[PDB]
Amino acid sequence: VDQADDAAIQQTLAKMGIKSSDIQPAPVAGMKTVLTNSGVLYITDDGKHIIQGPMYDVSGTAPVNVTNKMLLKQL
Amino acid sequence: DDAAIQQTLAKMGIKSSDIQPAPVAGMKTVLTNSGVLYITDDGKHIIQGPMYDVSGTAPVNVTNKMLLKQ
Structure with missing residues (x-):
């Protein structure tokens, strides 16, 4: 994630x-x-714009909770 | 875009x-x-929501706006 996108998202969160x-x-x-x-x-x-999670990958035959999978990697 | 969305929803x-x-x-x-x-x-991909517009003074819940519009 680049500096400009990060600044915009941070600036927003802070505002x-x-x-x-x-x-x-x-x-x-x-x-x-x-x-x-x-x-x-x-x-x-x-x-x-903000959309509250979670996000699901639903391209397959069962939904995959992508938010949960990434949380387990990042916490 | 709608056949793809419709198939996902049907699944x-x-x-x-x-x-x-x-x-x-x-x-x-x-x-x-x-x-x-x-x-x-x-x-x-699906995202649960709600969605907020945060381009102005405070967060605005646009999901709630959509719902109330019926």
């Missing part, structure tokens, strides 16, 4: 009053995985 | 679905008979 983070890739173009103490949030690279 | 056992626009690129709003989900155009 909203939500504090620390770990910003990670997401398997959806134009957005990133943001771990906060208010949950995992999927935030657009421009910082204008 | 999931969702019968009633209303596909609407979403203000995030690559995504649509799915209004089900049990609530709102966000799905990518290729139908491969």
Whole structure:
């Protein structure tokens, strides 16, 4: 994740009053995985939209909880 | 984008679905008979929501806006 996207997401989070983070890739173009103490949030690279998690990969025959899988790697 | 979204929803056992626009690129709003989900155009990822617009003064819950619109 580049410095410009990270700044936008951080700037937004800070303007909203939500504090620390770990910003990670997401398997959806134009957005990133943001771990906060208010949950995992999927935030657009421009910082204008947040979608609350979790995210599921539903391309297969059963849903895969991608948020949980990444949390276990990142906590 | 809709056959791909429709196939995913059918696989999931969702019968009633209303596909609407979403203000995030690559995504649509799915209004089900049990609530709102966000799905990518290729139908491969779902995000639970809600969605907030945070371009202004404070977070605005646009999912709630969509729901109340019916």
